[PDB]
């Protein structure tokens, strides 16, 4: 005939790419949480307009304490200064406020001004939402005590249950596809990931946690997530999935000899996934094959 | 580290066995069957006591039949034996008959006793179990119809469901294990498996034909069966899960050095399973370490 009209593709060696999905829960990570604890014993004053849940930058206020013991041990060093002392004790007890807890800030302006550092407005350390508050106005902080607990959400925690006879299948996070019913245009970047040792009894499943990237305070801890996973298998023949053809007990496709001649050639499939099949016996690598054709007898 | 009473064991590089288990459904097999179909067309008689159920061996019952169309083919042929007919024409008709699909042990009855054969009692081939077999007295069959049929029971099948991703894992069916809920057997040999490359739309489950050796009779379909499975992982470090100690972020155990002397060594489990665990990082291969009893500090 000589009338051809084909596009082709070659077979090659390689793994089958499975996919699978599975449910996953936003979480909280157990690393980014702060105690704003207190140094030295006081009582409080202001307290400032948080509530219990609000959220917080680099805790810019969060309340003023007076501390007593604190400025008598300042004052016995104005003294020393006024009256010509060792350089050496002046910073000495210097030191020893600075192991009682005084901010170098407070320090700083004790030296320039003298005036004394009476009362001082204790800040949140890092960014987030507090977790547990309370206090009122004029009560006194033992020793260190809590006097709020933040929680960070610079990272988010999405935990799947993975089943444990596929967990060393994993390998790369770029198997992992994350996506959320809710806010969905947002695009989820797994930043790390680990497998928490810890079986399911129930069942038998791992638990496979993801730090995703939250920056746009887009991801609250109990939205529901799907974990699109991916897999591999021992290298087999791969032939384009379209390329093949089937009528029944038997299943075949076309071999082309660059000649451009045709020819039928039996194989013996494997299984198929995701766009391809894969042969257990056949053809052989680097033959050709067409996966566009089209002709009849 | 001054104790006798210490059991060990060594750290070897080999994979995890993650066993699992999914349902069978058993079955007939389409192969071990038995159609008994009629040759030229024809009418019923008798049709015995069987009912569409129940057992016999090598069909020596069954059902009679007789047809028109062959004693009248048969009776000319007699007037030629009688009359001058030629040595291979008598002959030629008798050709005419046998493909025409007399039997030919009724056709050497006709020749023997010169007598118009005309009712056919035919027998089942196989002991069996008759599947199909309503049909009785005075019917029309025709071209090859199906009269009857039967089924064997020296294979049966149990078919489970596998999941796409577990599939290449199979191989070798030694990681199988059959068991029955009903009647627990001895014992039930697989003398034959197969994985049909059919993926199940519905879900990604492949098909795991399982051939049950039942030289016995104590298996029906429908019956409900469990199969065991079990995969393994690419290799890893393996140390006995007994010999692991950790409550927090210390995560490790204890080295020998031969000396009987001991050392902390920092270790990171990967996974566990069974009764062992895999290291990711931590020991290596031939390290020995302690499974068992104990020392003062």
Redesign the interface.
């Given at each position: 005939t000589q009338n051809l009209g084909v596009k082709t593709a070659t077979v090659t060696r390689g793994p089958?790419t499975?996919?699978?999905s599975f449910p996953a829960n936003v979480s909280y990570n157990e690393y980014q949480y702060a105690i704003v604890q207190a140094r030295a014993a006081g009582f409080i004053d202001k307290v400032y307009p948080l509530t219990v849940g609000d959220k917080v930058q680099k805790g810019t206020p969060l309340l003023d304490l007076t501390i007593p013991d604190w400025v008598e041990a300042q004052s016995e060093y104005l003294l020393l200064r006024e009256t010509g002392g060792t350089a050496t004790q002046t910073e000495g007890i210097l030191e020893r406020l600075r192991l009682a807890g005084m901010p170098e800030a407070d320090i700083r302006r004790l030296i320039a001004t003298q005036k004394i550092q009476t009362r001082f407005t204790l800040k949140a350390p890092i960014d987030g939402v507090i977790t547990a508050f309370d206090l009122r106005a004029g009560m006194n902080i033992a020793k260190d005590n809590v006097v709020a607990k933040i929680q960070g959400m610079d990272p988010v925690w999405v935990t799947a249950a993975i089943?444990?006879?596929?967990?060393?299948?994993v390998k790369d996070a770029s198997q992992f596809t994350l996506t959320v019913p809710a806010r969905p245009d947002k695009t989820l970047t797994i930043r790390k990931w680990t497998?928490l040792?810890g079986?399911d009894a129930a069942t038998?499943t791992?638990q496979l946690r993801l730090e995703v990237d939250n920056a746009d305070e887009a991801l609250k801890p109990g939205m529901n997530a799907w974990l699109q996973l991916n897999?591999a298998?021992?290298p087999?023949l791969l032939i384009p999935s379209q390329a093949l053809i089937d009528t029944g007990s038997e299943q075949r496709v076309i071999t082309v000899d660059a000649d451009g001649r045709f020819v039928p050639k039996r194989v013996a499939?494997?299984?198929?996934?995701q766009g391809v099949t894969a042969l257990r016996s056949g053809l052989a690598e680097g033959e050709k094959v067409v996966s566009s054709g089209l002709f009849l007898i």
């Open positions: 089958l499975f996919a699978q089943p444990e006879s596929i967990a060393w299948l497998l040792p079986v038998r791992l897999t298998s021992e087999m499939v494997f299984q198929a996934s």
